[PDB]
Design a protein around this ligand. Structure first.
Ligand SMILES: C[C@@H]1O[C@@H](O[C@@H]2[C@@H](O[C@H]3O[C@H](CO)[C@H](O)[C@H](O)[C@H]3O)[C@@H](O)[C@@H](CO)O[C@H]2O)[C@@H](O)[C@H](O)[C@@H]1O
Lengths: 315, 310
């Protein structure tokens, strides 16, 4: 009977659940043709994590593992294969009912970040301390060599030789390498977690409005670029702090839809209302695409459990 | 009186409040000679943020601003002067009662990360990013005055007058010449000026107690080392305390580290009002504990409470 609640956090106090970025704006895009089925930032209102979702902000689009060897690839750069474990260092068991190790990226693109290594072996003359190195790196999640569900991925570097075989390796995500057509950025296209031509499994379900006039409402962040033109964004269904809150609370869901109000604390006024659905996503009554222009002190407050029949006041 | 609580998170579900890293181990170091007065991950038990502490995990050791000038180093490398704003993009007001913009690094060292830029003008805007280092012990590190410097291996491709973000990744080095000391504060306004508005130092006050830290290992760009960053409370505890703002009923809470499987208490600790832990331990090093363990609030006690030795 534990009452359902959301944390009290302005947009300026929230972070994206699909890439390590602050939330910049609320956003809608009603004419989206893609199926929306992201795998990070997936949590039911009663606290069940789904997809590849995990709790750490540092785990989103991160990998841990070991480089095996440099490998040939037709594409530009120097390429390296790495085995991947769970983020906690334990071996990834492909028989677990998840799509891929938790935290694995959930979109097609060239993810830019830093690969770092801290050697296992230490040197006596260096105070029994290990050698280290880090370099910029790109992981193309659409590559046939992106196979995290099989425990292996590949990354490329500008650096031509200074990556060590057999050593503990971390990928820290930073942004995208490019959003040119040839870099295949599509935030709603899932990677093939086991490779070219295989079917993904254990997915969090797709989400959609079902009531006429309603559209999804997203928490949008702008993602950095290594180069080229663009202002790319990543849209999540709920911020990471909501994932963290719902997981902690695990309040029973008393219907399939929670009515929430976006409120301005100063005025006490409701700016608009939204449906927060059981599977963990928002809809609003809006007939346009683009940002929601709202006071910076605003946040969502739980109002009451309603049902799928409920008619939202238009934004 | 809203009851005081901690989140229910294992070590493997926590992140560091002083650098964007997962928590690796609990750690003690009783013989520490330095004053411990970190400025990130500072929050009272009743939810008052202190020092340079802010809520976003993405804001810890981050900067936002614009580059104003390129200055070449004497030997190797290129430096760039950068004006900094608040992380929310508003102008930083030096008259506000904080030591520096929230999220500013709180230790001496060469912080390694990536500088990225997305131009204002455009059509789609142009972008660039490069590896960068910020030497927080440099005379040019003056975030409280609104300006810092970073260095790059890249010699030319950093633009002036364009929105710039620093994403922290690790340290550049921990060699002698790189001045890494996690307990030495930067001089936020430069070397001849006193830091102000600081979160207070923390220490045990009872014989046989020592501070208990949440430790993370931090990546290195190069060199030998296994550097760590120790925080007083993880970022999720800061976030939780801020949310709850439960009244503190004494100056010291008693907490128990429990194995929820067996239900047994592994050890107990004092959680002090100002937001830090002490334990009765007379050794340095990691705490060896079951991966399922976490801290649970027990009761309010006082400075004279004797902790069970661990
Ligand atoms: C211990 C050592 O640490 C790193 O080497 C740096 C070295 O880095 C340069 O040379 C290496 C190859 O030796 C790579 O190409 C780097 O890209 C270069 O920057 C220099 O920085 C020297 C300067 O005193 O310090 C060394 O520590 C690392 O790259 C090595 O793999 C190795 O782990």
């Amino acid at each position: 009977s534990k009452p359902f609640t959301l944390p009290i956090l302005t947009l300026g106090e929230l972070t994206n659940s699909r890439f390590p970025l602050p939330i910049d704006v609320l956003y809608t895009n009603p004419n989206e043709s893609a199926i929306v089925q992201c795998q990070n930032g997936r949590c039911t209102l009663d606290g069940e994590l789904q997809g590849t979702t995990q709790l750490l902000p540092t785990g989103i689009c991160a990998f841990r593992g070991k480089v095996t060897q440099q490998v040939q690839d037709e594409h530009r750069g120097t390429h390296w294969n790495m085995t991947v474990t769970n983020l906690n260092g334990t071996p990834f068991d492909p028989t677990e009912d998840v799509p891929a190790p938790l935290g694995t990226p959930d979109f097609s693109g060239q993810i830019y970040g830093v690969i770092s290594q801290r050697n296992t072996n230490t040197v006596p003359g260096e105070g029994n301390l290990p050698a280290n190195r880090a370099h910029e790196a790109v992981i193309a999640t659409y590559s046939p060599k992106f196979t995290p569900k099989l425990g292996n991925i590949q990354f490329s570097t500008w650096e031509t030789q200074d990556v060590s075989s057999g050593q503990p390796t971390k990928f820290t995500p930073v942004g995208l390498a490019s959003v040119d057509a040839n870099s295949h950025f599509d935030q709603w296209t899932l990677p093939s977690y086991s490779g070219a031509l295989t079917l993904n499994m254990n997915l969090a379900p797709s989400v959609a409005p079902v009531f006429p006039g309603e559209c999804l409402l997203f928490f949008r962040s702008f993602i950095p670029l290594k180069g080229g033109y663009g202002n790319p964004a990543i849209d999540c269904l709920m911020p990471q702090e909501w994932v963290q809150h719902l997981y902690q609370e695990s309040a029973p869901s008393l219907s399939d839809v929670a009515l929430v109000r976006y409120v301005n604390p100063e005025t006490g006024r409701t700016l608009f209302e939204a449906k927060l659905h059981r599977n963990g996503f928002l809809t609003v009554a809006r007939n346009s695409a683009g940002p929601v222009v709202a006071p910076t002190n605003g946040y969502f407050r739980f109002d009451s459990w309603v049902n799928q029949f409920y008619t939202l006041a238009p934004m």
